[PDB]
Design a protein around this ligand. Structure first.
Ligand SMILES: O=S([O-])[O-]
Ligand SMILES: O=S([O-])[O-]
Ligand SMILES: O=S([O-])[O-]
Ligand SMILES: O=S([O-])[O-]
Lengths: 63, 158, 158, 62, 159, 60, 158, 60
């Protein structure tokens, strides 16, 4: 076991690239979280392929 | 990113112990109407920031299904079952999307989790409660605010 | 018998509301190596006693699998996902049998629950935590003492 | 409303089944606390003993 | 009963080699709407008669589904994939029931076959074409005339 | 050897679908080497069946 | 590319009717040990040449499994079941890889096929026999010669 | 037609299996009306592949 360097308050950067039913998309993400409290939030922006022709919900567990 | 889960002292936290170097996950999502997705995330850390390189691919969603018709409302709260399979930490989830009309749309998830560095201790079987929510969005879902809360536990009796 | 589950006030208790007339269930158990079981139970009540008429059928278990080789140790604690499908209360569970060597053997369970009396109010989506344990048994499992504990809840954040 | 379910209940049980071609009968007698979500039961194999398969597969059906 | 299947000379016929003592099979039927059936048949022979002790159990069929609503027309022709798994001959089938309104209803079938005698040689991988038909029935299906045709083969290009 | 070009078939099916018990008797004939068989089926108990007869057919 | 299939007169040939404009397919491959693949092909035509834009993504293959261990020998000959679902031609297949030691490794495949042009007539239910063969390869499979033969039919009796 | 008896096939596959990226090019010929085709494949990126090539073959 070692020091994780994980702070109680962390920032989150994210880029998602994907394809659903032939439809390509790029989604950028920026958020914050509390790892030891098990909580996070993120602001997501569709950069390419918007508006998405499918339910956004299917992507959410993958951010 | 399972680093954002409250782990009690009696359960090994594979995810927080994977840092500073990080970890990756691969996932399949199998929907009850034949829609199937795969996803990958490579998670790193620099300073006070986690970085996520995510890929997502989905096929065989029927044209008049709730996904292509955008008839989903939310993921219901779930419980991930975490165990070692073929030497790799694996999470299986019975998931359900609430639809318009109060019906549910089932999805089975399997995630495999792999630390980047050697020496990360593997946990015994445990459970992780999840709840995920779109707090707000614009009309076309071009902009979305997402929130998640997760807590690891040992199940009953407690 | 899901009448033996602690239901909080804010969740409809379909099973206690099914009595005194009672209810039935049907279940499929799909194991990861192709073994499949179906089970039924007709539950009635006379005075202070519940009566259970149970049938259980299993096919396609491999000769050298953990079931026929008796390599299982216990069911791990689980969470049943309760929801309505086609006007019938349905429970789905991601289950796992602990095996010798601390490997796991997966089983997907689906149960449908039906009250004897018409117009018993169906509950909304909820979770039921489960833990089942063989407290004691003789060498050949001809005599077995069994114990179960179940608690219904709404999941996170509660 | 009026369920007639008592805080302490007895449980009677009879299971008949067939796994892998092997027929069996199992009788059960136990007690439970419906409102605490707890039960226990003594089970006895009446036919088909000893069972050639893992007893664990049966347990959630009792 | 896979005894009633045309086997060519180049494929081991496990089922005809299982007699006079006979064989048994176990089956799971997994329908796309969550309906699940299990079935068993113990097959014996006395003189010129085959005897079948069959058991069939089905659970979780939706109330408004094609099965409970009796909206099925026929099984479409199918091809069974025969292979050995854990010392046992196994047949997997991608099946489909035709429904009223010309939609299909998918079912996945797995059968395991076991000869009664020891030492009956297991065949190599092969395919068995199937077609099953209700030739006639009364209004309530209390009386049914059933027919099946089956042919084993090696697949392309040797079929 | 043991199997003849023309064979008789006797059948008894007992079962339960959706909680509904049934018994079905069968008598028929077949040609094992031609891969063909026919059977007359009769519901002894549980008639009329509340489910599609088709789901049973591959199990006869 | 199902354009390379011998179709008899009594079965509509959706694939040959999809040209010159072309068609696309999406596919899921679900292996029995949890490995899952999704794939897509966009097929176009110019003169006497078909052009294929193919994407292939797979996750959750165990390190000790026959795929990552490279213990496969060939796909066994198969039969694809072709049918319409939600207005789209769909193919389901029970597939098997022959492994070293003559064991088999099962894969379930579902493909959806969609013509680019509007108004291409959907065929009725039919079967397509397949056989696929690596004819030759170098040591590391950096160079491979592949062959396929496919024939559409109506099944028994004919 | 649009379909000729003897046709050529050009192909590019890009993919990722278990995290391993690859690119594969193909050049082949086939006979549409006979339902036969063959192709020469070459791994351009990601060689040697760490997984069984067989999993890819039906996707060319
Ligand atoms: O649904 S939860 O994330 O508040
Ligand atoms: O596993 S529980 O019943 O202690
Ligand atoms: O449909 S077949 O059995 O002629
Ligand atoms: O396997 S076949 O394509 O020769």
């Amino acid at each position: 076991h070692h020091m994780s360097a994980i702070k109680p308050d962390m920032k989150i950067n994210l880029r998602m690239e994907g394809n659903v039913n032939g439809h390509h998309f790029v989604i950028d993400g920026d958020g914050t979280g509390k790892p030891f409290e098990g909580k996070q939030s993120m602001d997501l922006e569709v950069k390419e392929g918007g508006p998405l022709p499918f339910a956004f919900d299917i992507l959410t567990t993958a951010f | 990113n399972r680093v954002f889960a409250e782990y009690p002292d009696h359960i090994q936290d594979y995810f927080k112990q994977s840092f500073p170097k990080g970890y990756s996950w691969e996932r399949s999502l199998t929907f009850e109407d034949g829609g199937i997705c795969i996803a990958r995330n490579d998670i790193t850390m620099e300073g006070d920031t986690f970085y996520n390189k995510v890929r997502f691919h989905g096929v065989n969603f029927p044209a008049n299904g709730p996904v292509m018709q955008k008839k989903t409302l939310k993921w219901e709260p779930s419980t991930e079952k975490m165990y070692v399979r073929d030497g790799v930490l694996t999470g299986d989830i019975t998931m359900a999307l609430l639809l318009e009309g109060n019906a549910h749309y089932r999805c089975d998830s399997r995630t495999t989790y792999k630390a980047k560095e050697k020496g990360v201790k593997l946990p015994g079987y445990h459970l992780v409660d999840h709840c995920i929510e779109i707090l707000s969005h614009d009309k076309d879902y071009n902009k979305v605010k997402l929130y998640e809360h997760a807590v690891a536990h040992s199940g009953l009796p407690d």
